[PDB]
From Swiss-Prot:
Lineage: Eukaryota, Metazoa, Chordata, Craniata, Vertebrata
Site (Fine-tunes the proton-transfer properties of H-64) residue list: 4, 59, 64
Effect noted on mutating residue 118 to K/R: Strongly reduced CO(2) hydrase and p-nitrophenyl acetate esterase activities
pH dependence: Optimum pH is 6-8.
Record protein name field: Carbonic anhydrase 2
Gene this protein is translated from: CA2
Keyword Ribonucleoprotein: no
Family that this chain belongs to: Belongs to the alpha-carbonic anhydrase family.
Activity: how regulated: Activated by X-ray, histamine, L-adrenaline, L- and D-phenylalanine, L- and D-histidine, L-His-OMe and beta-Ala-His (carnosine).
Cellular component annotations (GO), alphabetically ordered: apical part of cell; cytoplasm; cytosol; extracellular exosome; myelin sheath; plasma membrane
Binding, Zn(2+): 91, 93, 116
Source organism of this protein record: Homo sapiens
Outcome recorded upon mutating residue 116 to D/N/Q: Reduced activity
Modified residues (Phosphoserine): 162, 169
Comment field (misc): Target of drugs used in treatments against glaucoma disorder and breast cancer.
Catalyzed reactions per annotation: hydrogencarbonate + H(+) = CO2 + H2O; urea = cyanamide + H2O
Length: 257
């Protein structure tokens, strides 16, 4: 029943998922005046060279590019993390226009979209098991700013027409997620949650300071999928972002000043 509209959107989620008003919810606003530089924060290791993509799925609230996580292939290590986390999928959040779309904000600035690369801790058995743990997941968050095109995104935006209908998927092998990464791995980090129901508080967030540039042409293509439903004249998938939640009793640490 949950979604992003007036009657089932983010301000309604707490009824089905009370944890929506919990102590470690995401996203948040990253205020650069109060994020704390932490010299003990290690550089992030993003080792995606062996990535094996499988398919792309419209799950009714985003499109997910899913990966073979049956063995160590594309993994996240280092940074604030205690071990190895396997990439299982990435997806985006975006707006109904370019001025909004991101879930995290920086000094209240909204970006046109936000990329989430979702990884689970190989200390646990699988993704299902990991989301039940406070250190189960690591999500690498990357802002999308409109400008020059990101060439590594083109394969993704080109295939979206094939999965406009909720639930549909398409084969999506040999996509390399290294083509979605900015130059710098400077990051903010804090303990948080999934930003969609069930909103489980199982995520170490790592949000990159540097956005990637994508073109207006590219982000337009995100806006062609539908939210679950079919017709006769139903609803396109835009503004699938949760607004910033209160930081509460947490601290956002930065790997940089
Ligand atoms: Zn997300």
């Amino acid at each position: 029943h949950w979604g992003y509209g007036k009657h089932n959107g983010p301000e309604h989620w707490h009824k089905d998922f009370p944890i929506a008003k919990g102590e470690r919810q995401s996203p948040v606003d990253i205020d650069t005046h109060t994020a704390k530089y932490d010299p003990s924060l290690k550089p992030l290791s993003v080792s995606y060279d062996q990535a094996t993509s499988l398919r792309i799925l419209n799950n009714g609230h985003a499109f997910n590019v899913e990966f073979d996580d049956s063995q160590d292939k594309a993994v996240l290590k280092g940074g604030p993390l205690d071990g190895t986390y396997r990439l299982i999928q990435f997806h985006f959040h975006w707006g109904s226009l370019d001025g909004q779309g991101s879930e995290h904000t920086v000094d209240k600035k909204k970006y046109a979209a936000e990329l989430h690369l979702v990884h689970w801790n190989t200390k646990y058995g699988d993704f299902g098991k990991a989301v039940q743990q406070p250190d189960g997941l690591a999500v690498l968050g990357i802002f999308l700013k409109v400008g020059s095109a990101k060439p590594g995104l083109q394969k993704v935006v080109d295939v979206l027409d094939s999965i406009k209908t909720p639930g549909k998927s398409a084969d999506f092998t040999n996509f390399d997620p290294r083509g979605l990464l900015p130059e710098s791995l400077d990051y903010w980090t804090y303990p948080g949650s999934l930003t969609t129901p069930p909103l489980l508080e199982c995520v170490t967030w790592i949000v990159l300071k540097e956005p990637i540039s994508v073109s207006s042409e590219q982000v337009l293509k995100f806006r062609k999928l539908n939210f679950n439903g079919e017709g006769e004249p139903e609803e396109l998938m835009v503004d699938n972002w949760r607004p910033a939640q209160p930081l509460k009793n947490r601290q956002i640490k930065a790997s940089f000043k």
